[PDB]
mmCIF file with all atom_site columns, C-alpha atoms and ligand atoms in Angstrom:
data_model
loop_
_atom_site.group_PDB
_atom_site.id
_atom_site.type_symbol
_atom_site.label_atom_id
_atom_site.label_alt_id
_atom_site.label_comp_id
_atom_site.label_asym_id
_atom_site.label_entity_id
_atom_site.label_seq_id
_atom_site.pdbx_PDB_ins_code
_atom_site.Cartn_x
_atom_site.Cartn_y
_atom_site.Cartn_z
_atom_site.occupancy
_atom_site.B_iso_or_equiv
_atom_site.pdbx_formal_charge
_atom_site.auth_seq_id
_atom_site.auth_comp_id
_atom_site.auth_asym_id
_atom_site.auth_atom_id
_atom_site.pdbx_PDB_model_num
ATOM   1   C  CA  . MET A 1 1   ? -20.709 -11.831 -4.091 1.00 29.08 ? 12  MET A CA  1
ATOM   2   C  CA  . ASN A 1 2   ? -19.476 -8.646  -2.402 1.00 32.41 ? 13  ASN A CA  1
ATOM   3   C  CA  . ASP A 1 3   ? -21.756 -8.610  0.697  1.00 33.47 ? 14  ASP A CA  1
ATOM   4   C  CA  . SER A 1 4   ? -20.815 -11.976 2.142  1.00 30.18 ? 15  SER A CA  1
ATOM   5   C  CA  . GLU A 1 5   ? -17.085 -11.471 1.459  1.00 28.05 ? 16  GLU A CA  1
ATOM   6   C  CA  . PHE A 1 6   ? -17.309 -8.067  3.165  1.00 31.52 ? 17  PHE A CA  1
ATOM   7   C  CA  . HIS A 1 7   ? -18.951 -9.635  6.232  1.00 30.58 ? 18  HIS A CA  1
ATOM   8   C  CA  . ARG A 1 8   ? -16.296 -12.333 6.313  1.00 29.59 ? 19  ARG A CA  1
ATOM   9   C  CA  . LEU A 1 9   ? -13.297 -10.030 6.058  1.00 27.02 ? 20  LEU A CA  1
ATOM   10  C  CA  . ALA A 1 10  ? -14.651 -7.296  8.306  1.00 24.69 ? 21  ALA A CA  1
ATOM   11  C  CA  . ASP A 1 11  ? -15.575 -9.869  10.960 1.00 26.11 ? 22  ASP A CA  1
ATOM   12  C  CA  . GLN A 1 12  ? -11.972 -11.116 10.846 1.00 27.86 ? 23  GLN A CA  1
ATOM   13  C  CA  . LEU A 1 13  ? -10.537 -7.569  11.116 1.00 29.87 ? 24  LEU A CA  1
ATOM   14  C  CA  . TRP A 1 14  ? -12.793 -6.905  14.116 1.00 26.52 ? 25  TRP A CA  1
ATOM   15  C  CA  . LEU A 1 15  ? -11.492 -10.007 15.856 1.00 26.99 ? 26  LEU A CA  1
ATOM   16  C  CA  . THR A 1 16  ? -7.898  -9.258  15.066 1.00 24.02 ? 27  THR A CA  1
ATOM   17  C  CA  . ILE A 1 17  ? -8.163  -5.775  16.532 1.00 19.01 ? 28  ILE A CA  1
ATOM   18  C  CA  . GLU A 1 18  ? -10.110 -6.919  19.590 1.00 24.77 ? 29  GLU A CA  1
ATOM   19  C  CA  . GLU A 1 19  ? -7.639  -9.713  20.330 1.00 26.44 ? 30  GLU A CA  1
ATOM   20  C  CA  . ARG A 1 20  ? -4.532  -7.551  19.833 1.00 24.29 ? 31  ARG A CA  1
ATOM   21  C  CA  . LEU A 1 21  ? -5.833  -4.828  22.218 1.00 21.68 ? 32  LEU A CA  1
ATOM   22  C  CA  . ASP A 1 22  ? -6.974  -7.270  24.869 1.00 19.96 ? 33  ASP A CA  1
ATOM   23  C  CA  . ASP A 1 23  ? -3.540  -8.732  24.708 1.00 22.52 ? 34  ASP A CA  1
ATOM   24  C  CA  . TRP A 1 24  ? -2.017  -5.282  25.172 1.00 24.33 ? 35  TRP A CA  1
ATOM   25  C  CA  . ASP A 1 25  ? 0.737   -5.435  27.728 1.00 27.82 ? 36  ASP A CA  1
ATOM   26  C  CA  . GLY A 1 26  ? 2.525   -2.137  27.220 1.00 24.29 ? 37  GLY A CA  1
ATOM   27  C  CA  . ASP A 1 27  ? 2.831   0.729   29.665 1.00 24.21 ? 38  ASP A CA  1
ATOM   28  C  CA  . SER A 1 28  ? 0.005   2.787   28.258 1.00 23.96 ? 39  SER A CA  1
ATOM   29  C  CA  . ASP A 1 29  ? -3.615  2.224   29.250 1.00 21.96 ? 40  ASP A CA  1
ATOM   30  C  CA  . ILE A 1 30  ? -5.468  1.450   25.997 1.00 22.95 ? 41  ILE A CA  1
ATOM   31  C  CA  . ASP A 1 31  ? -9.159  0.574   26.032 1.00 23.77 ? 42  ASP A CA  1
ATOM   32  C  CA  . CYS A 1 32  ? -11.260 -0.984  23.277 1.00 25.73 ? 43  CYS A CA  1
ATOM   33  C  CA  . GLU A 1 33  ? -15.088 -0.976  23.287 1.00 23.42 ? 44  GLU A CA  1
ATOM   34  C  CA  . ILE A 1 34  ? -17.676 -2.201  20.791 1.00 22.44 ? 45  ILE A CA  1
ATOM   35  C  CA  . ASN A 1 35  ? -20.906 -0.187  20.533 1.00 19.74 ? 46  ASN A CA  1
ATOM   36  C  CA  . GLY A 1 36  ? -23.531 -0.820  17.856 1.00 17.34 ? 47  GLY A CA  1
ATOM   37  C  CA  . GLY A 1 37  ? -20.822 -2.799  16.024 1.00 17.85 ? 48  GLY A CA  1
ATOM   38  C  CA  . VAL A 1 38  ? -18.480 0.210   16.044 1.00 18.48 ? 49  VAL A CA  1
ATOM   39  C  CA  . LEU A 1 39  ? -15.035 -0.221  17.645 1.00 18.61 ? 50  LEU A CA  1
ATOM   40  C  CA  . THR A 1 40  ? -13.741 2.692   19.751 1.00 17.50 ? 51  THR A CA  1
ATOM   41  C  CA  . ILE A 1 41  ? -10.128 2.657   20.989 1.00 17.60 ? 52  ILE A CA  1
ATOM   42  C  CA  . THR A 1 42  ? -9.535  5.209   23.818 1.00 19.28 ? 53  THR A CA  1
ATOM   43  C  CA  . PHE A 1 43  ? -6.113  6.442   24.889 1.00 19.44 ? 54  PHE A CA  1
ATOM   44  C  CA  . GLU A 1 44  ? -4.928  7.946   28.146 1.00 15.11 ? 55  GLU A CA  1
ATOM   45  C  CA  . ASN A 1 45  ? -4.778  11.443  26.707 1.00 16.93 ? 56  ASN A CA  1
ATOM   46  C  CA  . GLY A 1 46  ? -8.521  11.207  26.013 1.00 16.27 ? 57  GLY A CA  1
ATOM   47  C  CA  . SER A 1 47  ? -8.033  10.804  22.254 1.00 15.62 ? 58  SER A CA  1
ATOM   48  C  CA  . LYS A 1 48  ? -9.799  8.026   20.372 1.00 16.22 ? 59  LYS A CA  1
ATOM   49  C  CA  . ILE A 1 49  ? -9.666  5.927   17.230 1.00 12.73 ? 60  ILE A CA  1
ATOM   50  C  CA  . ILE A 1 50  ? -12.985 4.807   15.733 1.00 13.74 ? 61  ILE A CA  1
ATOM   51  C  CA  . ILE A 1 51  ? -13.420 1.923   13.252 1.00 15.40 ? 62  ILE A CA  1
ATOM   52  C  CA  . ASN A 1 52  ? -16.705 1.168   11.556 1.00 16.82 ? 63  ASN A CA  1
ATOM   53  C  CA  . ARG A 1 53  ? -18.281 -0.661  8.665  1.00 12.87 ? 64  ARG A CA  1
ATOM   54  C  CA  . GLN A 1 54  ? -19.730 1.176   5.670  1.00 11.35 ? 65  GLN A CA  1
ATOM   55  C  CA  . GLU A 1 55  ? -21.889 -1.681  4.380  1.00 13.92 ? 66  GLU A CA  1
ATOM   56  C  CA  . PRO A 1 56  ? -23.230 -0.085  1.152  1.00 15.62 ? 67  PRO A CA  1
ATOM   57  C  CA  . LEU A 1 57  ? -19.674 0.487   -0.048 1.00 13.70 ? 68  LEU A CA  1
ATOM   58  C  CA  . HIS A 1 58  ? -18.089 -2.679  1.385  1.00 13.67 ? 69  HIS A CA  1
ATOM   59  C  CA  . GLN A 1 59  ? -15.600 -0.389  3.160  1.00 13.96 ? 70  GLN A CA  1
ATOM   60  C  CA  . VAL A 1 60  ? -14.103 -0.160  6.604  1.00 15.30 ? 71  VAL A CA  1
ATOM   61  C  CA  . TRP A 1 61  ? -13.611 3.404   7.805  1.00 13.36 ? 72  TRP A CA  1
ATOM   62  C  CA  . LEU A 1 62  ? -11.038 4.748   10.236 1.00 13.14 ? 73  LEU A CA  1
ATOM   63  C  CA  . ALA A 1 63  ? -11.354 7.970   12.208 1.00 11.19 ? 74  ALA A CA  1
ATOM   64  C  CA  . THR A 1 64  ? -8.302  9.146   14.141 1.00 11.99 ? 75  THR A CA  1
ATOM   65  C  CA  . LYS A 1 65  ? -7.430  12.342  15.923 1.00 8.80  ? 76  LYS A CA  1
ATOM   66  C  CA  . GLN A 1 66  ? -5.573  13.316  12.769 1.00 6.69  ? 77  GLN A CA  1
ATOM   67  C  CA  . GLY A 1 67  ? -7.955  12.337  9.907  1.00 6.35  ? 78  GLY A CA  1
ATOM   68  C  CA  . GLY A 1 68  ? -10.516 9.963   8.307  1.00 5.91  ? 79  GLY A CA  1
ATOM   69  C  CA  . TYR A 1 69  ? -9.392  6.964   6.133  1.00 3.18  ? 80  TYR A CA  1
ATOM   70  C  CA  . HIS A 1 70  ? -11.675 4.753   3.987  1.00 4.40  ? 81  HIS A CA  1
ATOM   71  C  CA  . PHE A 1 71  ? -10.608 1.230   3.100  1.00 4.70  ? 82  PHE A CA  1
ATOM   72  C  CA  . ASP A 1 72  ? -11.417 -1.118  0.218  1.00 4.70  ? 83  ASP A CA  1
ATOM   73  C  CA  . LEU A 1 73  ? -11.168 -4.869  0.463  1.00 4.77  ? 84  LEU A CA  1
ATOM   74  C  CA  . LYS A 1 74  ? -8.284  -5.863  -1.797 1.00 3.97  ? 85  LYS A CA  1
ATOM   75  C  CA  . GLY A 1 75  ? -7.052  -9.467  -1.519 1.00 5.94  ? 86  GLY A CA  1
ATOM   76  C  CA  . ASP A 1 76  ? -5.596  -10.101 1.912  1.00 9.02  ? 87  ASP A CA  1
ATOM   77  C  CA  . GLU A 1 77  ? -5.612  -6.440  2.770  1.00 11.22 ? 88  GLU A CA  1
ATOM   78  C  CA  . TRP A 1 78  ? -7.580  -3.305  3.414  1.00 12.17 ? 89  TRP A CA  1
ATOM   79  C  CA  . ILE A 1 79  ? -6.368  -0.488  1.198  1.00 11.07 ? 90  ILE A CA  1
ATOM   80  C  CA  . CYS A 1 80  ? -6.882  3.222   1.849  1.00 9.93  ? 91  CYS A CA  1
ATOM   81  C  CA  . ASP A 1 81  ? -8.841  4.440   -1.142 1.00 8.88  ? 92  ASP A CA  1
ATOM   82  C  CA  . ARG A 1 82  ? -7.017  7.756   -1.353 1.00 8.20  ? 93  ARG A CA  1
ATOM   83  C  CA  . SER A 1 83  ? -3.395  6.835   -0.575 1.00 8.21  ? 94  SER A CA  1
ATOM   84  C  CA  . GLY A 1 84  ? -3.128  3.076   -1.219 1.00 13.46 ? 95  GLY A CA  1
ATOM   85  C  CA  . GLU A 1 85  ? -1.731  2.586   2.290  1.00 15.56 ? 96  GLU A CA  1
ATOM   86  C  CA  . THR A 1 86  ? -2.778  -0.495  4.338  1.00 15.92 ? 97  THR A CA  1
ATOM   87  C  CA  . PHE A 1 87  ? -5.239  -0.467  7.200  1.00 14.90 ? 98  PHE A CA  1
ATOM   88  C  CA  . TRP A 1 88  ? -2.776  -1.967  9.690  1.00 14.79 ? 99  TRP A CA  1
ATOM   89  C  CA  . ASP A 1 89  ? -0.073  0.456   8.809  1.00 13.37 ? 100 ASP A CA  1
ATOM   90  C  CA  . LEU A 1 90  ? -2.338  3.469   9.270  1.00 12.46 ? 101 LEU A CA  1
ATOM   91  C  CA  . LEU A 1 91  ? -3.991  2.096   12.395 1.00 16.70 ? 102 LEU A CA  1
ATOM   92  C  CA  . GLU A 1 92  ? -0.548  1.405   13.935 1.00 14.27 ? 103 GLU A CA  1
ATOM   93  C  CA  . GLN A 1 93  ? 0.716   4.826   13.027 1.00 13.46 ? 104 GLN A CA  1
ATOM   94  C  CA  . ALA A 1 94  ? -2.238  6.582   14.616 1.00 11.55 ? 105 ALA A CA  1
ATOM   95  C  CA  . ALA A 1 95  ? -2.362  4.287   17.658 1.00 7.78  ? 106 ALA A CA  1
ATOM   96  C  CA  . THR A 1 96  ? 1.358   4.843   18.149 1.00 7.26  ? 107 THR A CA  1
ATOM   97  C  CA  . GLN A 1 97  ? 0.981   8.553   17.889 1.00 8.82  ? 108 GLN A CA  1
ATOM   98  C  CA  . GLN A 1 98  ? -2.037  8.772   20.143 1.00 13.04 ? 109 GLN A CA  1
ATOM   99  C  CA  . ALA A 1 99  ? -0.654  6.399   22.804 1.00 10.54 ? 110 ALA A CA  1
ATOM   100 C  CA  . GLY A 1 100 ? 2.822   7.964   22.690 1.00 12.80 ? 111 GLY A CA  1
ATOM   101 C  CA  . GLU A 1 101 ? 4.034   4.381   22.644 1.00 14.36 ? 112 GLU A CA  1
ATOM   102 C  CA  . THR A 1 102 ? 4.844   1.848   19.925 1.00 13.58 ? 113 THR A CA  1
ATOM   103 C  CA  . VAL A 1 103 ? 1.582   0.120   19.078 1.00 16.28 ? 114 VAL A CA  1
ATOM   104 C  CA  . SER A 1 104 ? 2.959   -2.490  16.674 1.00 16.75 ? 115 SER A CA  1
ATOM   105 C  CA  . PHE A 1 105 ? 0.896   -5.572  15.834 1.00 18.21 ? 116 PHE A CA  1
ATOM   106 C  CA  . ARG A 1 106 ? 3.130   -7.475  13.383 1.00 17.53 ? 117 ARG A CA  1
HETATM 107 CO CO1 . LIG B 2 .   ? -23.397 -4.577  -1.050 1.00 15.92 ? 211 LIG B CO1 1
HETATM 108 CO CO1 . LIG B 2 .   ? -14.087 -2.093  28.760 1.00 12.28 ? 212 LIG B CO1 1
#
């Protein structure tokens, strides 16, 4: 039911972020690290973005310099449970702001 689908979609999200950041060619130095399954993106200004799994809830959480965002699996997207906004849009907006460079993955 929910557990296996969570593992499937989260594993895919992890890969998509990892691949996109390894393939980062822009001017800014952006680093991505995985520690205890948690992804940490680090920017040149020392700021970070942290992405982790909340297994009980089947949610992916985002922590940015600006706030914390909790995402529900909904179809082919991750949806911010307060605002309805998508995971990629919010991750791009924060990454763009923290890198001071467009960080656009679509
Ligand atoms: Co469960
Ligand atoms: Co490294």
